[model samples]
Target: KKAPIINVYNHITGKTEKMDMENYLCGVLAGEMSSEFDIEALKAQSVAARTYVVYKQEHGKSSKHKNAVVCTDYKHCQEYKSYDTLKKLNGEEWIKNKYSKIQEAVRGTKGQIITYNDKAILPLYFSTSSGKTENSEEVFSAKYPYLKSVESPYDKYSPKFASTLKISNTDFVKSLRRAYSTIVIDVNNLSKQVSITKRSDAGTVEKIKLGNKELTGKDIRTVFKLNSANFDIKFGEGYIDFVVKGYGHGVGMSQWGAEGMAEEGYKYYDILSHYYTDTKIKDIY
Candidate 1:
C-alpha cells in the first residue's frame, strides 16, 4: 500500500489542508504532549494519534467538517501545531533541539496504527496515571477490551503524579449546598457527614455521600477541581484537604508511564502493548 495523505481541518485558517500523514503526526506530537519524554515514548504516542485519525477516516466524515479526515481542534479531534507555530510558541532553541526529535519519532512510526480485530482502536492517552490505569468501563460508558486497567508502576516518576487541593470546611460545604439543596452538614465533624462510599478497581472514587445525598467521584472532583478522581479526604480544624493522585481521566496510555517504559529499554510497540492491551500495530498503507 502507498503512504496515506490526509485532509485536516485547520480551524485557524478556516479551511482544510492536505498533508502527508507523517508530517501531520509531527504537528500533533509537538502540540499535545510534553517534549521531554523519550523518543520511544513519543513513537508510541505517534501511533496512537495516527490510529485515532485513521479510525475517523474509515468510520465516516464528521458533520463539523465535511471533507477533512481530522481537525486541529484538540477538543474535536487532536491538537496540532504547525512547524512555524512551534517555533514561535517555543523558541529557536526548542525547534532545533525538540522538533527534529519529534519528526524522527513520528517518522519512525510512519503509517503505523494500533488495531483491534483489524479495526483502528480509539487510543485515549493522558498526562499521568495513579498506580494503575483505569478500565474503560470505570470512567466511560462503553468498555473496549484493549482499554482494560493495567499496572503502570513507572507513572510515579511524573512530577504531576500527585496533587493537593485545600479549601475551608465552610467553603466546601457551601459549594456542596449549591449542588445539593436542603442538605445539612454538622460542620463540626465534616468527615462524618461527608464520606466516600465506593471506589473503582483503579481506586478512583466511584460513589460519595454528602449529608444524605450522593454524588459520583467525578462530581466531587469537579466541585473542588482536584486533579484526578483518586483522592483522599483530609479534614483539618477549619479546612478540608484532598490529596489527589494521578492526572487526566486515568484511561488508556499514561504518557509518563510510557516514558518510564522507554527508559527501561522497551521499544515503541512494547510500550504500546503494555497500555493498550492485546492490540496489534500494523501499517495503514
Candidate 2:
C-alpha cells in the first residue's frame, strides 16, 4: 500500500512541497519536541503531530495560502524542520546521537492518532505548562471537553519551567504605548502602581491594572513578549521584574510533562490520556 502525501506551503520561499506523510512527520518531530526525550514521549508527539495533519486535512485547514492545506510555520500549524535544516541546527552531533531515535518514534507510531467521540481531535500541544494544562475556554473561545485542565507537575523539571524578565520602567511604558497608545504608566511609581487584579483558576493572570486603566493578561503578555499569561510582577528601584511560570499557551499536551511521565515509566498513551483528558489512542490506518 502506498503512504499518504501532504501538501505543505512554505511561507519563507512561497513554494509548495508534496511529500510522504511519514517523511513529513520527521520534520514535525524534530521541530516540535526535543530529540533528547525518551522514545515513549517522542512516539506520543508523533501521534499528536500525525493527528494534527489529519485533522487539518478533514477540516480543510487553509490560511495565508489558498493552494496549501497547511503551512510550515509552527505558529500556524506545526513546525517543520527538514533533515538538512535539522542537520544544520543540531549538527552531526544530533545526527549521530538522536536522528535514529527520532526516526524510530515516527516509524513506530506510523498509522496512529488520537480520537475523541470517534472523531480526530485537534491535538494541540505546547512546550511546557504552569504545572497544569488549561481549560480550552480559557485560552480559546471554543471549548473542547477533551482539552480540559489536568495536573502536570512534571513540567517543573524543564529548564524553561521558570523565567524572569527585568525591564526598565521607561522601556515598559514605551513598549505598552507602542501596542496600546492610550496606555498610561506612572513612570515615577511604576512598580507601586502596576498590579494584577484577577487570575484564572489555573493561575493565568486574567486582568491587570496599569496606572488607572486595566488590561487583560493576554494584552500584557503580548505587549511585553512574555512567555505565558501565568506570571508575577515584582517592583524594584528603576525596573520591574516579571517572574514567569511555564511556557507556551498552557494547553493540551505539555512536552516537558510528557518527558516527565515517560521518565516515570508511563506509556505514550498514558501521557496523552493524562494531559488530554478522556481521549483515546486509535490506530486509524
Candidate 3:
C-alpha cells in the first residue's frame, strides 16, 4: 500500500511540497524538540504532532497556503525542518545515530491520536511551564475542559523555564507608547504606574495596569516579546527587570514536563493523559 502524501506549505520559502506523513513527522519532531530527548518523550511528541495535523485535516481547517492543508510556520501550525537542514544543524554523524530513533518513535505511535468526546482536539503544547499548566481560557479566548490547569513540577527545572529581561525606563516607555499610543505615564514614576493587577490560576499575568489603561497579559507579552505571560516585574533604579517563568502560551502539554515524566518512569500514554486530562488515545487509521 502506498503511504499517505501530505502537502506542507513553507512560508519561509514560499513554496509547497508533497511529503509522506512519516517523513513529515521526522521534520516536525526535529523542529519541535531536541534530538537527545527521551525516546518515550519523543514518541509522545510524535503522537501530539500527528494528532494536531490529523485534527486539522479531518476538520478541514483552512490554511493560509493556497494549495496546502498545513504550513511549516510555528505560529500558524507547527515548525518543520527538512531532513537535509536538520542533518546540517545536528551533523551527519548525529543524524545517522539519532534519525532511526526518531523514526522508531514515530512509527511506534503510528496513527494514534488524543481525542476528547469522540473528536480530535487542538493539542496545544509549549516548551516548559512554571511548575503548572494554564487553563485554556487563561491563555486564549475560548476554554477547553481538557486544557485545565494542572501541576507540572518537572518543567520548573528546564532552562527555558525561567528568564530575565532588563529594559531602561526610557526604552520601556518607548515600547509601551509604540503599542499603546495613548498610554500616559510619568517615566520618573514608572514603578507605580506599571503593576500586575491580576493573575491567572497558573500565575500567568491576566491583567496589568500600564499607566491608566489596562491591557491583557497577552498584549503585554506581545509588546515586550516575552516568552510567556507568566512573569514578574521589578523596578530598579533606572531600568525595569522582567523575570519570566515558563515558556510559550502555558496551555496544553509541556514538552519538558513530558520528558520529566518519562524520566520518572511514566509511559507515553500516562504522560499524555496527565496533560490532556480525560482524553483517550486511539488509532484512527
Candidate 4:
C-alpha cells in the first residue's frame, strides 16, 4: 500500500507561542485527520473535512438531542441552512461564520495532544532565504508563503520526519477509522432547497445528488466519547454536551490562540505544553 496524503493546516494550537512546523503537520494529521495518514496534504485536508463535518453536524445534532443541542437565542446559536446557501459562501468564511457558536461552545483548554512511546516530535520553523540579516526567528517564514513561492509547488512537510513523530502507524489508522467509520447523518432535518456538490481546485466538479444514500449523517459524538457507547458523557443527560472548548478540529496548532500567546512572552514549548498536556519537550535530530 502507498503512503497516505495529508493536508497540513493550522490545527488550532490555542493561545500558544510560534507555530511548530513539525507539530502543525504531524499533530494535525495524527490527531485530527488520520493518525495513520502518512502524507501531509491528506492530513490537513482531513482536519478541514472534519471541521466542515463538525460544523454541519452541530446544527442538526442540536435538533436531535436537546441535551446535546445548545439552546440559545438565534444570535447565540450557530446558523444552519440547507446545503444550498452553505455552498454559496466561500467554504472558509462559511465554515468560520456558521460554526462560530460551536467554536465558542467548546472554548476551554481542550484538544490537547498526547504522546505515546515517548516519541520526540520536533517542530520545524522554516525561514525563507531572505539575504537580509535577521535573527533565526525572523528567518523562519510562514508555511503558506513558502509553498506559494514555487510554481506548481507541493506541500513542504518531510515524510521522514512525520513518520518518526508517530508512535504506531497502526494505532494512527485505528483512530481515523474510528472517526470516519460510522458517521450519523440526519437527513430528515435538512431543508429541501439545500444541495450538495464536491469541487476541486482545478475546476473539477461532481454534483452530490440527494438520495437515501446521500442523505446521511455521522455520529461524531462517539469520536469525542472516551469509552465508546458504554459510558455517559460527564455533563449532560446521557447525551453529549461536548464542552468542546475550541472552535476548529482540535488538531495541529491553534492559529488565533498561538498568535496571542506569541505576543504574550510564550515559547514554542510553553504553547505546545498548553495544548499537548504533560509531554516532555525533547529535541530530535
Q: Top TM-score: which candidate number?
A: 3
List model 4 lDDT by residue over 1-285, tens digit each. Answer: 322222222112212233322322222222222212222223222223233222333344433233332211212222223223334643756445533322322221122222323543222211111111112122122322111211111111222111111113233225434555552333232233223344222111123222232321112223333211111112222222222122222123333333334445555445445433344433222
**Model 3, 15-87: lDDT tens per residue?**
8888888889988988898878998899889999988877877876474775786789988888899888877
Worst 10 residues of 2 by lDDT: 60-69
Runs of candidate 1 exceeding 4 Å displacement: 1-20, 60-77, 177-188
User: For candidate 4, what is the TM-score?
Assistant: 0.22
Global lDDT of each candidate:
0.88, 0.86, 0.87, 0.27
Clashes per prediction? 0, 0, 0, 43
Question: By lDDT, highest first, what's the ranking?
Answer: 1, 3, 2, 4
Please list the residue runs of candidate 2 whose C-alpha ends up more than 4 Å from where it truly belongs after superposition: 191-193, 212-214
Worst 10 residues of 4 by lDDT: 125-134
Q: Candidate 4's C-alpha lDDT?
A: 0.27
Model 3 misplaced stretches (Cα beyond 4 Å): 1-3
The residue ranges of model 4 lying beyond 4 angstroms of the native Cα positions read 1-117, 121-211, 214-249
User: Per-residue lDDT of 145-208 in model 1, one digit per residue for the tens?
Assistant: 9998999999899998999988988898888888778877766789888888988878888888
